[PDB]
Amino acid sequence: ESADLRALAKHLYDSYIKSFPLTKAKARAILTGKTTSPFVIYDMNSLMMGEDKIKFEVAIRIFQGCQFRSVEAVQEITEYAKSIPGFVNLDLNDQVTLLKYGVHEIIYTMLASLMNKDGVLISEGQGFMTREFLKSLRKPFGDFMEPKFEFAVKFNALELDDSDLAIFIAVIILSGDRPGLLNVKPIEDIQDNLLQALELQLKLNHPESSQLFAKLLQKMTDLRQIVTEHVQLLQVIKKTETDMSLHPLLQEIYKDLY
């Protein structure tokens, strides 16, 4: 059982590397300056000038940029989801439900890997947008990113690694608590095995953090609250600025979500 759970941990990490181009290992090296620098975006001038580096009013340009990144993040997570053993053999309707509720919780989890207390890396590390600039936007645009920074500062203090995060994000989407699940028992059988590999991984990689498993599970509900606040803030955009419209992929995610 022990050698099988460690093979599942090694299986998820290799699939993790192949699914996400900007890993946490690379991101922290860019933030600390311990490598061989991203264009800093701190105002409208640096944004209107750094638009040639962004993979894609001032607030609307940040809105459109996030939507473009979000569409790409969903596709990378979906690719990782298809590599979780047993996930692809589940019924296709439950695969959609599992990804419909788990994508944003994983996006915010991996959004912490690229964050420090000052800002967030954008465009696979080529840019750096500051928290002070994201908080000074016109409302309600200025209150979208601050809850993510507050969570990332607390979440990064756990000092998880890419091998730890690979199992943890797998635990997130394999949650049998999602509404609309047709066959719950096989999904919980996969998660319970994913939790065992996660528990074993945190004991091997972090022999100092005694209750890291317990602390990690407690942040797993903070992600559901961020999603709720993000949804209720997106509905204000739909009502206030009647000019904005969500991407068809993001529209299907939030369509009848919770």
Binding site: T78, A81, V96, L249
Partner: peptide, 9 residues
């Protein structure tokens, strides 16, 4: 469904 197309790819 756009999600189904990404799962069936």
């Amino acid at each position: 469904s756009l999600l189904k197309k990404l799962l069936l790819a």
